[PDB]
Amino acid sequence: SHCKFEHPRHGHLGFLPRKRSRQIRGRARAFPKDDATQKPHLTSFMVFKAGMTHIVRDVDRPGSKVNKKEVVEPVTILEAPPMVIVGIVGYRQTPVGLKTIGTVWAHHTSVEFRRRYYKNWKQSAQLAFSRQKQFANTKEGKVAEARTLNAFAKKASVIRVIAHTQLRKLRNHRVGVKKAHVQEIQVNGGSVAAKIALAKSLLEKEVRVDSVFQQSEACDVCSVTKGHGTEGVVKRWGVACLPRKTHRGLRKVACIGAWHPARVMYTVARAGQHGYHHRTQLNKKIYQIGRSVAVEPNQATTTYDLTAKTITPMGGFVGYGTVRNDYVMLKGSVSGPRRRVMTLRRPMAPQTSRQLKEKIVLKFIDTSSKIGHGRFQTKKEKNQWFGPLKKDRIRREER
Template sequence: QSHRKFSAPRHGSLGFLPRKRSRRHRGKVKSFPKDDPSKPVHLTAFLGYKAGMTHIVREVDRPGSKVNKKEVVEAVTIVETPPMVVVGVVGYVETPRGLRSFKTIFAEHISDECKRRYHHRTEINKKIYKIGQGYHTKDGKLVKNNAATEYDLSNKSITPLGGFVHYGEVTNDFVMLKGCTIGVKKRVLTLRKSLLVQSSRRATEKIDLKFIDTTSKFGHGRFQTVEEKKAFMGPLKKDRIAKEETA
């Protein structure tokens, strides 16, 4: 058939209109949770870079539910959160009309990357499943084992075989969020603390990860680690030739 059908579901989300180039890449936080002066100073929001998605296996802790104490497979998003550089500090004072900025202090030397200014789509209640530590040195050795769990003790990093598609390797600290997030790979995301104190049973559920998938995301991945792949596939031709040359 060469003609077009006249009835069809609409294509694409209306939440992303207007489809045009954004004025700024970094998401702007429009509202912050109410500050508690009795608590120590802390960051209410921080930035991260979307690396990609994978899936996990966990045991549900929801008494009364049909899936209580059963294993479920859920999709998760990995957001890499490298250390941030503070370029300015703003002081606020309490006025009858609310908080007003009192003084702004900027760093004297700011790199060109910080001077550059996507879509202001906001999603709330993203549950954090894991806060992982990046590559670090311990006793003179490089430690990459940040995807192991209490049930899966294999030595593997959060980066899948071959790296995250269109992103690469996650070497810094990372945050694992339940489900998907908006934006393409490498997109900078602004993560903000919840405005309200979460009290629902689903939000306060204890997350017990049993398994984190690290198979290749380029196709039908079968192997969790490079060692597992080598043990099954055998040595490569180049490895065999190199071994013969050194022998």
């Protein structure tokens, strides 16, 4: 007999299985459609999550109560040192699926990259890529590099670039990984020979974020959520916890099925995982693409604040530390905890709208400590509210 009162089911059956992701890497499962008019460009970039702050900006959206007014929007900072491009790869198109054709390796790879192939590197003989670096040259090795490029030109549909992160140039000793995270990046636009022209010029050269993305563009992110380990049905799905009096415990689901089918359906909520599942968010709009402190300090200064400052809060990002390299600053939450690699990819969803086409102008960026309640924006603002202090009255006696 029917259920007394209807209510929407809990959870989204399309994210099944709830399954701990095969990779922490968060690769893009697709890339945007080729326009094949626009000049070739790289469609995505690897990025490390640092933390969150809020900002103050003033909206321009005719028709709203917020119309010309200031609004405080939380924002996530993601540092993004230059990626290096080690390889070119291209894809023949067959009546079943794409298929790779070959791959053309750059003539020099760092130890960051071939750090991948071993699982214990320093005690290895460290021979990765030893033989091609030897065979990539002389004669029989100039030819074979040339015929696989010619294979791409004739037989390839899609052409991608193998690019890895630089974990030296990012000096963060809480991330711990000295293996270089590797992904493929698709080159969209131009004819197939125009893609090979670009990709062949990228090899061995770094790629900064600002070449891939623009400040006020939106970018959708591919990342792996924070793993909670096995969780009950009430945290895993919505399940409206049962009344107090119940025997054998109240956080369970009560009826997991009818007599018939005599089985438990795949749609009934159970316990497990509630995992580090992979996810691709949409339309996360870039507020700021910064630049490294070494090059251009005054990262968090504006045409409004005008106080020499940086995006790293007082006392660093908790559990992360100072953001040394150039970073994207991005409105809203991004899935995954601090430290995790993520990929920003050129947005797939069609972007025509007031919200998603706008020029972002930030009034303020909050550098106050994220430990406790930070009431000071800079270390100078703090030394003004205190001044001379017992440990300071001492250190001058060292003089």
